[PDB]
RNA sequence: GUGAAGAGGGAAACAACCCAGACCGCCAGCUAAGGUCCCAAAGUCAUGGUUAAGUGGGAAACGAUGUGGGAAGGCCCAGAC
RNA sequence: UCCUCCUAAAGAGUAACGGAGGAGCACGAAGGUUGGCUAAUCCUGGUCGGACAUCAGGAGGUUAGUGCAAUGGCAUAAGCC
RNA sequence: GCUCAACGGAUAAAAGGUACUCCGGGGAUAACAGGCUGAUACCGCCCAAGAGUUCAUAUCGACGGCGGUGUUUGGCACCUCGAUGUCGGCUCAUCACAUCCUGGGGCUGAAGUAGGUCCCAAGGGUAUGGCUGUUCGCCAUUUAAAGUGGUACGCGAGCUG
RNA sequence: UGCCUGGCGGCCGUAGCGCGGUGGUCCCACCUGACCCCAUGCCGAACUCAGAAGUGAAACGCCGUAGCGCCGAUGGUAGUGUGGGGUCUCCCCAUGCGAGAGUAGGGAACUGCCAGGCAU
């Protein structure tokens, strides 16, 4: 009548959580906005995916002057 | 002439303070200035006949704890939302 | 030293308390077992602390 | 009566009814009548109690209502099989949890206020009892 | 989580509830859930209070000098009722 | 058939004849880059000008905007020349 | 190039009727009756603005509150489809009591007469006809009274259709 | 070494707004003047250049500042895993974990590589 539709979401959120070790090319956070920002040695894609450039351990770091979540990459 | 006779609780927190509430008592706290927060119990029905006057909340109180008549004033009070009771009082050291 | 016995059964209880008895090796009522001591063993006994009797 | 002039969306869910109160003490006047049980207050009962208590106050003093019903309760119409959607809003209900106050009064003395609140207590589905003005 | 694909004691019987997981044999001992006045096995076991209504052994709004315990007050040999 | 929030129980996912909404296009720039800039609203003064055109400061600080639904973003602007 | 839009797309191409019907199944799934809640129905209670010359309580009760009974209209699809015959009459009943009559007591805005209204009481009794297929209903006419319900809305291995 | 002032940093409202004073030798702003160097969708307002008569008024840092905002106790609160119940539409028990809002309070930043001026 008026209430028939919905759409399943694109299975978003954090994929490689903060603390463990990732490779290069894999994705950390598939997200909508710039919700977790442009952290150290990660790229924000076209659809603002957080993908690492180097290898090693991830770390969820607060930074910035407006309290923004940056997602970091350092060499393990 | 308003006085207070009380002693100090053994174990703190929720499950102990509920039995202390059941056993005709209720907690309090005494803070302020230089002395640390003193976490004592009180007598329930022996201060129900004392909180019935505004001089409780406008006059000095002498608490006899540790052999020391502390000179306090009433600070804040909590009550059971559907009971004629008392729950928890603050007392500043002033 | 420690000692452990199991007095209540485990059938109608959780799979979070049907795998601590794996790590305690208790396979029957009365299956008394001595193990080591550490904070981890006390933490693995305070999850099933309604159905064992410690013997010390 | 009371009713919302505007809801953002049309029909709300049921929820549940857990928790103690928030508006615990007398906040404006001198005398109060306070709920004890757990339940649900419609739009009609509170204004019926408002008339049944105004009739005892005889336009003297002042009274305050604080609760205001806004839950869009519904009904499924009679002789319709259970499917084919939800129903249309029939009346507007307030939620009353144990301890919440409903009305406050000033001016008119307390011994009149006993029976003046007892009459409006006798038209209400959950047991209430009187409380006074507490100086802190 | 039982139950379907699971037997057994307690809920009278009662797939789903609590106890508990029986491979076979014995005229052997300890308990769980639950019971101990006889039916049907085990306390008419001891102190210790309430109840007088078969309440126990079905229920609301409200009602009342039924009843037991606590906390205060006012009036009083300026004898209060 | 696809898209947005909620029900969905702090990660993904989770249904019904449950609660509300949008799409089946556009853009030769509304694209890439360089350089630069910053709002909605009311008060006050002013040629016809009124409660609302344009002009002046001035308060206030994204309460504004995105080619369109919401949701999440957005000042380094992804908003505007 | 394919609004295959019924959007994983059967064909390049497609609408209805069966009370003349037939088959495999189905209590997964409808009607009849049960069983489960009890929303509507009915009957007792609570507050008591008022009406009643005075007066809430003789009799009614506004705006509202809570239950009972399982009794109408309903909701779920459990037993029942390798079948339990269904409405109403005729013939036989039995229990329930929220009691129509009859029995005993209190109130009244009860002088007597006749009544109002609750409380105890279910032993016994409860219309013959006109009209439609009809329970009911309306009407004519008696009596102390022409009660209300469950029993597969009792009863077709008992009877009309 | 000490104090002050200039680009860059750590820092993320205890670091920001309030109101009252402040300091111009050097630095910074205002300022001065403008044809080619560039400049305005009109215009030395912005943007660029040349120079230093004049001022520290506005900007810009300091001290004073509880009107704020902000941080923040201890104590109590319902929630809450896991297990037993009850007067099972929701609450009580033994166990831990026990926050938001508010009370007592702090609170006018702090610091680092660098260059100049004045003093010790
Ligand atoms: Mg607890
Ligand atoms: Mg609430
Ligand atoms: Mg399973
Ligand atoms: Mg099967
Ligand atoms: Mg069995
Ligand atoms: Mg059995
Ligand atoms: Mg039974
Ligand atoms: Mg048996
Ligand atoms: Mg076995
Ligand atoms: Mg036992
Ligand atoms: Mg025996
Ligand atoms: Mg005995
Ligand atoms: Mg009762
Ligand atoms: Mg006398
Ligand atoms: Mg989720
Ligand atoms: Mg565009
Ligand atoms: Mg104007
Ligand atoms: Mg840009
Ligand atoms: Mg298909
Ligand atoms: Mg398909
Ligand atoms: Mg197909
Ligand atoms: Mg084809
Ligand atoms: Mg024919
Ligand atoms: Mg023919
Ligand atoms: Mg056939
Ligand atoms: Mg069959
Ligand atoms: Mg079936
Ligand atoms: Mg039917
Ligand atoms: Mg049926
Ligand atoms: Mg029926
Ligand atoms: Mg019933
Ligand atoms: Mg009766
Ligand atoms: Mg009278
Ligand atoms: Mg009456
Ligand atoms: Mg049947
Ligand atoms: Mg057969
Ligand atoms: Mg049949
Ligand atoms: Mg009777
Ligand atoms: Mg009579
Ligand atoms: Mg009889
Ligand atoms: Mg009879
Ligand atoms: Mg006889
Ligand atoms: Mg005849
Ligand atoms: Mg005829
Ligand atoms: Mg007839
Ligand atoms: Mg019937
Ligand atoms: Mg029937
Ligand atoms: Mg019948
Ligand atoms: Mg029949
Ligand atoms: Mg027959
Ligand atoms: Mg028949
Ligand atoms: Mg025929
Ligand atoms: Mg100043
Ligand atoms: Mg200044
Ligand atoms: Mg200038
Ligand atoms: Mg807390
Ligand atoms: Mg806190
Ligand atoms: Mg500060
Ligand atoms: Mg300042």
PDB file of C-alpha atoms (C1' of nucleotides) in Angstrom, chain H:
ATOM      1  C1'   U H   1      71.777  33.265  31.426  1.00  0.00           C
ATOM      2  C1'   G H   2      66.964  36.644  31.943  1.00  0.00           C
ATOM      3  C1'   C H   3      62.728  39.579  29.623  1.00  0.00           C
ATOM      4  C1'   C H   4      60.107  41.041  25.156  1.00  0.00           C
ATOM      5  C1'   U H   5      58.868  40.363  20.008  1.00  0.00           C
ATOM      6  C1'   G H   6      58.499  38.015  15.411  1.00  0.00           C
ATOM      7  C1'   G H   7      57.268  32.268  10.818  1.00  0.00           C
ATOM      8  C1'   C H   8      56.752  27.382  12.334  1.00  0.00           C
ATOM      9  C1'   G H   9      55.096  23.117  16.122  1.00  0.00           C
ATOM     10  C1'   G H  10      53.271  19.610  20.272  1.00  0.00           C
ATOM     11  C1'   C H  11      48.633  20.542  22.032  1.00  0.00           C
ATOM     12  C1'   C H  12      42.146  20.134  21.337  1.00  0.00           C
ATOM     13  C1'   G H  13      37.443  24.664  25.023  1.00  0.00           C
ATOM     14  C1'   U H  14      41.370  23.826  32.714  1.00  0.00           C
ATOM     15  C1'   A H  15      43.997  25.956  25.975  1.00  0.00           C
ATOM     16  C1'   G H  16      37.761  29.688  23.833  1.00  0.00           C
ATOM     17  C1'   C H  17      34.090  34.519  24.704  1.00  0.00           C
ATOM     18  C1'   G H  18      33.300  38.738  29.045  1.00  0.00           C
ATOM     19  C1'   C H  19      34.612  43.619  30.737  1.00  0.00           C
ATOM     20  C1'   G H  20      38.722  47.034  32.554  1.00  0.00           C
ATOM     21  C1'   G H  21      44.489  48.657  31.590  1.00  0.00           C
ATOM     22  C1'   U H  22      48.378  47.811  28.306  1.00  0.00           C
ATOM     23  C1'   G H  23      53.365  47.821  24.771  1.00  0.00           C
ATOM     24  C1'   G H  24      55.852  50.447  19.982  1.00  0.00           C
ATOM     25  C1'   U H  25      63.768  52.174  20.318  1.00  0.00           C
ATOM     26  C1'   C H  26      63.901  46.903  17.192  1.00  0.00           C
ATOM     27  C1'   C H  27      59.722  43.501  15.174  1.00  0.00           C
ATOM     28  C1'   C H  28      54.325  43.581  13.497  1.00  0.00           C
ATOM     29  C1'   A H  29      49.818  46.344  11.912  1.00  0.00           C
ATOM     30  C1'   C H  30      48.037  50.956  10.390  1.00  0.00           C
ATOM     31  C1'   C H  31      50.147  54.129   7.252  1.00  0.00           C
ATOM     32  C1'   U H  32      52.658  56.944   2.698  1.00  0.00           C
ATOM     33  C1'   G H  33      52.547  56.844  -2.739  1.00  0.00           C
ATOM     34  C1'   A H  34      51.592  54.548  -7.465  1.00  0.00           C
ATOM     35  C1'   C H  35      52.991  54.975 -14.988  1.00  0.00           C
ATOM     36  C1'   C H  36      55.709  50.461 -17.037  1.00  0.00           C
ATOM     37  C1'   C H  37      55.754  44.557 -12.514  1.00  0.00           C
ATOM     38  C1'   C H  38      50.777  42.660 -11.557  1.00  0.00           C
ATOM     39  C1'   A H  39      46.011  44.282 -10.104  1.00  0.00           C
ATOM     40  C1'   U H  40      39.295  45.260 -10.047  1.00  0.00           C
ATOM     41  C1'   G H  41      33.797  40.372 -13.063  1.00  0.00           C
ATOM     42  C1'   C H  42      33.068  48.957 -10.918  1.00  0.00           C
ATOM     43  C1'   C H  43      36.887  50.791  -7.527  1.00  0.00           C
ATOM     44  C1'   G H  44      44.674  50.662  -4.986  1.00  0.00           C
ATOM     45  C1'   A H  45      38.352  47.650  -0.620  1.00  0.00           C
ATOM     46  C1'   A H  46      40.912  42.783  -1.772  1.00  0.00           C
ATOM     47  C1'   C H  47      45.658  41.794  -5.313  1.00  0.00           C
ATOM     48  C1'   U H  48      50.985  43.860  -6.683  1.00  0.00           C
ATOM     49  C1'   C H  49      55.032  47.351  -6.418  1.00  0.00           C
ATOM     50  C1'   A H  50      57.972  51.699  -4.488  1.00  0.00           C
ATOM     51  C1'   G H  51      59.219  53.897   0.057  1.00  0.00           C
ATOM     52  C1'   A H  52      59.105  55.284   5.795  1.00  0.00           C
ATOM     53  C1'   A H  53      56.604  62.051   7.134  1.00  0.00           C
ATOM     54  C1'   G H  54      53.093  60.170  11.220  1.00  0.00           C
ATOM     55  C1'   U H  55      50.453  56.905  14.830  1.00  0.00           C
ATOM     56  C1'   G H  56      50.327  52.411  18.348  1.00  0.00           C
ATOM     57  C1'   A H  57      43.661  54.252  17.853  1.00  0.00           C
ATOM     58  C1'   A H  58      41.762  49.522  15.334  1.00  0.00           C
ATOM     59  C1'   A H  59      44.058  45.078  14.791  1.00  0.00           C
ATOM     60  C1'   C H  60      48.174  41.833  17.788  1.00  0.00           C
ATOM     61  C1'   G H  61      50.509  39.494  22.955  1.00  0.00           C
ATOM     62  C1'   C H  62      50.493  40.460  28.250  1.00  0.00           C
ATOM     63  C1'   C H  63      48.951  40.790  33.017  1.00  0.00           C
ATOM     64  C1'   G H  64      43.560  41.791  36.263  1.00  0.00           C
ATOM     65  C1'   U H  65      39.120  39.047  35.672  1.00  0.00           C
ATOM     66  C1'   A H  66      34.515  33.301  38.717  1.00  0.00           C
ATOM     67  C1'   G H  67      29.601  36.374  34.184  1.00  0.00           C
ATOM     68  C1'   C H  68      30.335  32.244  31.588  1.00  0.00           C
ATOM     69  C1'   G H  69      31.454  28.050  28.587  1.00  0.00           C
ATOM     70  C1'   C H  70      34.928  23.661  29.892  1.00  0.00           C
ATOM     71  C1'   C H  71      37.221  19.891  33.227  1.00  0.00           C
ATOM     72  C1'   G H  72      35.831  17.319  37.591  1.00  0.00           C
ATOM     73  C1'   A H  73      35.514  14.362  42.574  1.00  0.00           C
ATOM     74  C1'   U H  74      34.068  10.706  46.525  1.00  0.00           C
ATOM     75  C1'   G H  75      28.925   8.981  47.648  1.00  0.00           C
ATOM     76  C1'   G H  76      23.855   7.251  45.878  1.00  0.00           C
ATOM     77  C1'   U H  77      20.788   5.756  41.207  1.00  0.00           C
ATOM     78  C1'   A H  78      18.005   2.235  37.474  1.00  0.00           C
ATOM     79  C1'   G H  79      20.455  -0.500  33.869  1.00  0.00           C
ATOM     80  C1'   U H  80      23.503  -5.137  33.470  1.00  0.00           C
ATOM     81  C1'   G H  81      26.593 -10.952  32.123  1.00  0.00           C
ATOM     82  C1'   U H  82      25.774 -15.548  34.837  1.00  0.00           C
ATOM     83  C1'   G H  83      22.826 -18.390  38.277  1.00  0.00           C
ATOM     84  C1'   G H  84      18.234 -19.134  41.703  1.00  0.00           C
ATOM     85  C1'   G H  85      13.508 -17.395  42.483  1.00  0.00           C
ATOM     86  C1'   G H  86       8.422 -13.760  43.216  1.00  0.00           C
ATOM     87  C1'   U H  87       3.017 -11.016  44.552  1.00  0.00           C
ATOM     88  C1'   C H  88       6.419 -13.252  36.518  1.00  0.00           C
ATOM     89  C1'   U H  89       2.250  -7.203  31.644  1.00  0.00           C
ATOM     90  C1'   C H  90       7.345  -6.103  36.089  1.00  0.00           C
ATOM     91  C1'   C H  91      10.409  -6.208  40.308  1.00  0.00           C
ATOM     92  C1'   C H  92      13.316  -8.715  44.648  1.00  0.00           C
ATOM     93  C1'   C H  93      18.264 -12.052  45.757  1.00  0.00           C
ATOM     94  C1'   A H  94      24.267 -13.492  45.932  1.00  0.00           C
ATOM     95  C1'   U H  95      28.064 -11.918  42.589  1.00  0.00           C
ATOM     96  C1'   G H  96      31.037  -8.503  39.820  1.00  0.00           C
ATOM     97  C1'   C H  97      31.432  -4.692  36.150  1.00  0.00           C
ATOM     98  C1'   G H  98      28.174   0.411  38.118  1.00  0.00           C
ATOM     99  C1'   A H  99      27.785   5.121  33.969  1.00  0.00           C
ATOM    100  C1'   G H 100      24.760  10.253  32.358  1.00  0.00           C
ATOM    101  C1'   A H 101      22.825  14.846  35.279  1.00  0.00           C
ATOM    102  C1'   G H 102      23.884  17.239  39.635  1.00  0.00           C
ATOM    103  C1'   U H 103      27.265  18.586  45.042  1.00  0.00           C
ATOM    104  C1'   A H 104      32.686  19.835  46.932  1.00  0.00           C
ATOM    105  C1'   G H 105      36.331  21.834  43.909  1.00  0.00           C
ATOM    106  C1'   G H 106      40.331  23.069  40.306  1.00  0.00           C
ATOM    107  C1'   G H 107      40.599  26.335  36.457  1.00  0.00           C
ATOM    108  C1'   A H 108      42.489  33.120  32.772  1.00  0.00           C
ATOM    109  C1'   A H 109      46.945  27.696  29.244  1.00  0.00           C
ATOM    110  C1'   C H 110      51.706  24.726  29.015  1.00  0.00           C
ATOM    111  C1'   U H 111      55.981  23.550  26.136  1.00  0.00           C
ATOM    112  C1'   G H 112      59.871  22.827  22.040  1.00  0.00           C
ATOM    113  C1'   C H 113      63.978  23.806  17.220  1.00  0.00           C
ATOM    114  C1'   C H 114      64.586  28.909  15.807  1.00  0.00           C
ATOM    115  C1'   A H 115      66.115  34.849  14.707  1.00  0.00           C
ATOM    116  C1'   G H 116      66.378  40.116  16.561  1.00  0.00           C
ATOM    117  C1'   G H 117      66.361  43.973  20.574  1.00  0.00           C
ATOM    118  C1'   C H 118      67.345  45.416  25.640  1.00  0.00           C
ATOM    119  C1'   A H 119      69.531  44.240  29.982  1.00  0.00           C
ATOM    120  C1'   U H 120      72.735  40.985  33.358  1.00  0.00           C
TER     121        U H 120
END
